[PDB]
Symmetry: C5
Subunit: 287 residues, 5 copies
Amino acid sequence: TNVSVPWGATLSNAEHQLIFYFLVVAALAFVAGFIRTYITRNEVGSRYRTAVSARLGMLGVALLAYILIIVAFLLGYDSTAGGWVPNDGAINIFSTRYIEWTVSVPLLTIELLAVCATLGVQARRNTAIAVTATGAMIFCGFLGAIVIDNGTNTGAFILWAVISCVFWVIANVVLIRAVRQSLPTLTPESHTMLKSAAIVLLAGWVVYPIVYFLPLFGASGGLTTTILITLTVADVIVKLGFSTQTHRVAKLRTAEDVRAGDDVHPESIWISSVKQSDAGLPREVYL
Amino acid sequence: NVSVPWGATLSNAEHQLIFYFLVVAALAFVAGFIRTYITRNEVGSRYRTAVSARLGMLGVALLAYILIIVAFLLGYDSTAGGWVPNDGAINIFSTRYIEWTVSVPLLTIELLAVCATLGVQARRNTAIAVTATGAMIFCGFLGAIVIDNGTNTGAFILWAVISCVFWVIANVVLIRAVRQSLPTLTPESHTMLKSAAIVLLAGWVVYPIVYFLPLFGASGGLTTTILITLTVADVIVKLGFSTQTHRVAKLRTAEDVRAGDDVHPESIWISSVKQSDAGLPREVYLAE
Amino acid sequence: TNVSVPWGATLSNAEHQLIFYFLVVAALAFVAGFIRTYITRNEVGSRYRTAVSARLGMLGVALLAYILIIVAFLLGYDSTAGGWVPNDGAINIFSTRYIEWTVSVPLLTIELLAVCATLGVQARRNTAIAVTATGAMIFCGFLGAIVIDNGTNTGAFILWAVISCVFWVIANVVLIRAVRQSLPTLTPESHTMLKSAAIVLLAGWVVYPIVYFLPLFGASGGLTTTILITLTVADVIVKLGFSTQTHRVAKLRTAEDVRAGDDVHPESIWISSVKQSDAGLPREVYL
Amino acid sequence: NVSVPWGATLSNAEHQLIFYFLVVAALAFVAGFIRTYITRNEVGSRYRTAVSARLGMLGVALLAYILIIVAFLLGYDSTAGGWVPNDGAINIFSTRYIEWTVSVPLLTIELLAVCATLGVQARRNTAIAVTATGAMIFCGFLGAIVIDNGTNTGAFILWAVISCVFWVIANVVLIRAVRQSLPTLTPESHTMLKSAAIVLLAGWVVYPIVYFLPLFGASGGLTTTILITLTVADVIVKLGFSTQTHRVAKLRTAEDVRAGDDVHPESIWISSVKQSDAGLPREVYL
Amino acid sequence: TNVSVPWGATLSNAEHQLIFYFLVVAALAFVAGFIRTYITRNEVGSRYRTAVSARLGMLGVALLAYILIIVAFLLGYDSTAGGWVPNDGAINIFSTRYIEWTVSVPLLTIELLAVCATLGVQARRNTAIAVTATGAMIFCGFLGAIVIDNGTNTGAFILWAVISCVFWVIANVVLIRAVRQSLPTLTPESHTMLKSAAIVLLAGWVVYPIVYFLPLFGASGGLTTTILITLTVADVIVKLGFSTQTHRVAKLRTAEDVRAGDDVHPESIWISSVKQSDAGLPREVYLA
Ligand SMILES: *C/C=C(C)/C=C/C=C(C)/C=C/C1=C(C)CCCC1(C)C
Ligand SMILES: *C/C=C(C)/C=C/C=C(C)/C=C/C1=C(C)CCCC1(C)C
Ligand SMILES: *C/C=C(C)/C=C/C=C(C)/C=C/C1=C(C)CCCC1(C)C
Ligand SMILES: *C/C=C(C)/C=C/C=C(C)/C=C/C1=C(C)CCCC1(C)C
Ligand SMILES: *C/C=C(C)/C=C/C=C(C)/C=C/C1=C(C)CCCC1(C)C
Ligand SMILES: CCCCCCCC/C=C/CCCCCCCC(=O)O
C-alpha cells in the first residue's frame, strides 16, 4: 500500500476555515449562477433550449451537491485543540463530490452537444455514448478511491483510475468529433464560440485526474486542504466559465436563425451591448 | 421465515455505494424536474396533462428519495468497517413504497394523457389504472413491511399475488388504450407511443422480481443489490419513460399545428429537426 | 358514554407504519396536486381566477399542514416493548389537523363561490358568511375535542359539536342557495358541472362530524388508527376530488365566454380531449 | 416593576390556543402570498409597486410567523403545573417586533403606491413613512425587550411615548397623501383608497393598547390574550388592508385602460363585474 | 497581539437580542428585496437584463448568507450567569459575513458595469478586473482577520488590510472610469441616476474598512455589538439603496431606447408615477 487517504490527515483551525470559506462561496456562486441562467433562459430560441435546461439542471445539482459536501465537512470533523480530528463521516466529503460529478459532468456533455449542429440519430447516439462514458468515468474513480478497501488498496486506486481514463478518452473523442463536424456548418463567429466553450470544458477536465493521484505522494493537513480547495475552484471555474460560453453560442445561433429569416424571437438579442437580432412576432394564423 | 433485508449488516463499501446511487438518483430527478419545467410550453394545451403528471411525479420522486436518504442515514450505525441495522432501517424500504404509491399512478395518467382515448373511455381508463397501481403498491407494503413486521412468509406471497392481480388489470387497460390509439395516430407518433409504453410496462417486471429476492435468504450483498437495483430501476424507467411521453406530446402538438387544427407561439424542434413553425392566434374585435 | 382521547391509546409497529404511509402519501399527493394546479392556472379566464388562487392556496396550506402533522406524529410516540407509547405531544397530531381545516375549508367555500354566478354585494356577503361560518365550525370542534378540559369533558365534546353543526348548516345553506341561484343563468353543460362539484364537497363534509364522535364508543390502537387514516383519506379525496371539478367548471365557463364572443383567451381550451374554445388575441389598441 | 408576559406560566388549553392561532395565521399568509402572486398581472405596470410591496410583506410575515412558532415551541416546558416559561420565552415577543420592523414599513409603501403622489412629493413621503414606522417598532423593542429585559417601567413608558411620536408622523404623512389623492381619483377609487387607509391606520391603535397591558399585572390568561390579539390583529390588518389596496390598483388600472391612457392584455373583473376589456399594444416598425 | 478578536468578548442579554433583531430584519429585508426584484424583472429591456440577473443573484446570496450568519450566532454563544459567553464557533459569525461579501460585492460591480455604456472588449476586460479585485479584496481581509493565526497576528491584520485596500482602489478606479466614460453618452436624467448609484456603492464601501480596524481599539461586548450591527445596517442600506438606483437607470435607458425607436417593450414603463415609455409589440414577420 502507498495510498494515504486524505480524510485521515488532521486539519489546522486556519485550514478548516479556508475549506469552509471556498465550499460555501462556491455554493453561493452556483445559486447566483442558477438565478442568472433562469432569468436569461428566454434569450435563446426553442431550437437550443436543451442547452439552457442542461445548464440550469447542472447548476441546480452542483448547488444541492455542495450543500451536502458542506454538511459532511461540518459533521465529519471534531475540534481537539491540536486541530480538527477526522470522524468516520469525513470520507463522505470526498464521496459527495463524486456524486456531484456523476450527475453534473453528464449534463455538461449534453449542454455542449446541444449547441452542436448534430442532427437526427448522429446526435442521439453521441449523447448516449458521452453520458454513459462520463457517468462510468466518475463511477470507476469512486470505486478505486472510496469503495474498494476504503480507498487504501494502491492496486485498485491505480487500476480503476486507468479504466476511468479509457472512458475519459471515449468522451473527449465523441465531443471533439461532434464539435469539429459542426464547426463547418456554423458561421465564423459561432464557430469560434463553440471551439472556445469546448476547450474550457475538455481542458479543465485534466485538473481532476491530476488531483486524484496526489494522495500517492503522501498525506498531510496541507495536501488534504490543497486537494479540496483546488477541486472547488475547478468545479466553480469550469461549470460557471463554460456555462456562460454555451449560452453566448445559443444566443448567436438564435440571432443568426432570426437574421437568416429561418425563425423569429419575441425580444431583441444582445452580446456585450451589441444588438445581434431585433424583436419579431409570428404571423397571425386563420383556421 | 422471510429474511427481512433490513436485518442484514452492510460493509463500509456497500453503505457508500447505496448512498452514492440514492443521492445521484435524487439529483438526477432535480435535473429532470428542472428540464421538464423549462420545456413545459413546448407542448399544446391539449396534451398539458402529460406535462403536469410528469413534473408531478418527478417532484414526488425527488422529495421521496430525500426521505429515503434520511431514513438510510438514521437506519444504520457504524461498527468499525461494518454498518449494523437499527429499528429505523425498515423505514428505508417503507419510504420507497410511499414513493411508488404516488409516482406509479401519475406515470399511468402521463401515458393515458398522450393516448388518443376520448370522452368517458379516457376518464374510465385513468380511474382503473390509478386505483389498480395504488392498490398494487399498497398490497406489497402490507405483505413486506406492515404484516408481522414483514416476517410472515405466507402474507409476503399472498399479498404479492393480490398485487400481481392489480398489476395485470393496469397492464391490460394501458396496453389496450395504447393499441386502440396507435391506429388513429401518425406513423412517427405511433412509434414513440409504443416505445414509451414498452419502457414503463417492461421495466415494471424488475420490481416484482426484486420483491421475492428476500425468500432466497438475507445478506449485506443481497440487501445492497435489492436497494441499488430498485434505485437504478426508478431512475431509468421514470426518466427514460418521461423523455418518451414528452417527445410524443411535442410531435402530436406539431401535427395539430401543421394540420391547421391549432397554433403554437414558438417553433417546435426534435433532435434539431423543425416539426412546426411559430404562429399567433388571429386578433378578434369583441362587440365593445 | 364518556370521552376516551385517541392520543392516549398505544399503537402497534404495523399501525405506526400505516399512519406514516398515508400521512406522507397525502402530503406528496398535495405536492402533485399543487404542481398540476399551478401549471394549469392559465387554462382559466381572468374572470374565474379567484377559483384557481383559492385552490392553489388550499393545496399549499394542506401540503404544509400535513408536514406539521407528520412531524407531530414522529415526536408524538415513543417505541417500547409494548409498541408505540403516546407522549405529551401526541395530542398535537389531532390539533394540527384542526389548524389545517380552519384555513383549508374556508378557501374551499371561496373556490365554489368563485365559479358561482353571484354578482355585486350578494357575492361578497355570501363569502363573509361562508368563511366566518366554516372557520367557526372548525374552531368550535377544536375547543370541544382539544382545548376544553384537555378533551376529557364529554359534555363540552357534544355541546360545541352541536354549536359547530349550526355553523355547518349556515355554510351548506349559503353555498346550496348560491349554486341553485347560479344554475339557471349558466349553460346545461356548466349547470351539470357546478352541481357535481357542490355535491362532492358538501357530501364528503358529513364524514368529518361522524369521525369526531368515534372516541365516545371507547379508545384503542385500532380505533385511533381508523380515526387518523379515515380523516387523511377524506382530506385527500375531497380536496383533490372537489378541486378537479371546480377547475373543469372554470374552463367550461371560460370557453363559453370565448365562443359567446364576450371575451378572448390566448390558447385553445380542452376537456377530456374535446376542444371547447380556439386560441384568440385581443385587438391591437392605439392610445 | 413591569410584569413581563414571558414570566407567566400557561395552561395546556392556553398553550394549544396560542399554537392554533399562530399556525393558522402563518397558513393564512401562505394562502394570501399564493393568491397575491397568481393575481399579480391583474395590475398595470404603473401600480406594480403596490403588488411587489404586498407580496414582499406577506413573504416576510409568513417566514416571521415560522420563527415565532419555533420560539413558542422552544420557549415553554411541559410540567405538572402546565407550561413553565424558560429563558427563550422572551424570543416569542422579540420575533413579532422583527416582523413589524419589516412588515409595517412595506404596508406604508403599498398604500403610497396606490396614492396619486408624483415626483419628489411621492419619494419624500415614502422615506418619512418607512423611517418613522421602522423607528416606531425599534423604540417599542428597546423599551419592552432590550432595556433591563423589559423590567424598567420608566423606559417601557418613555420609549412607548417616543414611538407614539413616530406613529403620529407616519399617520399624518399617509393621511395627507390619501387626502391629496382622493380629489384626482374617481368616486369608486376614492372610496376604496379611503377604506384601505382606515383598515391599516385604525387597526394600528390595537398594537399600542396591547403594549401597555403588562402594566395591569401578569397572568397565563393575560399573556394568552396579548399573543392571540396581536396574531388576530396582524392577520386581519395585513390581509384585510392588502385585499383593499389590490382592488384599488385594479380599478385604477381599468380606468387607465378605459380612459385610453394605457392598455392591458387581459380583461379586469371586480365581484364578477367587467371593468376593462383585453387590449394589445400596437405593433411598431423601427 | 494588540488585536482583540471581537468573538472573545462576552455579550449582555440586551446586546444578544439587538444583534439577532438586526440580523433577521436584514435577512427579511433581502427576502422583500428579492421578491420585488423578481416581480419587476420585465420592467427592463433584454439589453440591460445583466443588471437584473446580477441584483437578484446578489439578493439571493445575501439572503442565504445571512441565514448562515444567524445560525452561527445561535451556535456561537452560550447563556450563563455573566450573559452570553463566546464558544469555539463564535468566530464563524464574522467568517460567514466575509463569505457573503466574497460573492455579493463582485455581483454589485457587474450590476453597475451592466448599466454602464461600455462596449466590446473594454467592457469584458473591466468586469474581469472588478470581479477579481473585489473577490481578492475580501479574501485578503478574511486571511488577515480570521485565517492567519486565528486572527491574533496584529501585523498580518494590518498587512493584508493594506493589500486589500490596493485591490479596493483598483476596483474603484475601473468602475469610476467606466461611469465617467458612460455619463457623456447618457441623457441628463440617466447621467444623474448612474452617478447617484455609483456614489451610494463606492461611498458606502468606506464604512467596511473603518469597522475592520475597530478591534485594534480593544475588546467589548458593546464594541462587538457595534461592529456587527453597523456592518448589517451597511449591507442592507448599500445593497437595497444601490440596487434600487441601478434598476431606475435600466428602466430610464430602456424607455429611452423605446422613445428613440431603437427597440420596443411590451408594457408601459413608469418612474414615480410618470410614464417614460408606452407599450409596443414587435412587427409580425412572415418567414420564407
Ligand atoms: C463540473 C465538474 C467536472 C467536469 C468534473 C470532472 C471530473 C473528471 C473529468 C474526472 C476524471 C477522472 C479521471 C479521468 C481519472 C481519475 C478519476 C476521475 C473521475 C477524477
Ligand atoms: C417509478 C417506480 C415504479 C414504476 C415502480 C413500480 C413498481 C411495481 C410495478 C411494483 C409491482 C409489485 C408487484 C406486481 C408484486 C409485488 C409488489 C410490487 C408492488 C413490488
Ligand atoms: C379539506 C378538509 C375538509 C373539507 C374538512 C371538513 C371538516 C368538517 C366539515 C368538520 C365539521 C365538524 C362538525 C360539523 C361537527 C364536529 C366538528 C367538525 C369540525 C369535525
Ligand atoms: C402587520 C403589523 C402591524 C401593522 C403592526 C403595527 C404595530 C404598531 C402600529 C405599533 C405601534 C406601537 C406604538 C405606537 C407604541 C408602543 C409600541 C408599538 C410599536 C407597539
Ligand atoms: C454588500 C456588501 C458590501 C458592499 C461589502 C463591502 C466590503 C468592503 C468594501 C470591504 C473592504 C475592505 C477593505 C478595503 C480593507 C479591510 C478589509 C475589507 C474587506 C473590510
Ligand atoms: C429567515 C431567517 C431564518 C434564520 C434561521 C432560523 C433557524 C431556526 C431558529 C429559530 C429562532 C429561535 C428563537 C429565536 C432565538 C433568538 C435568540 C436571541 O435572543 O438572540
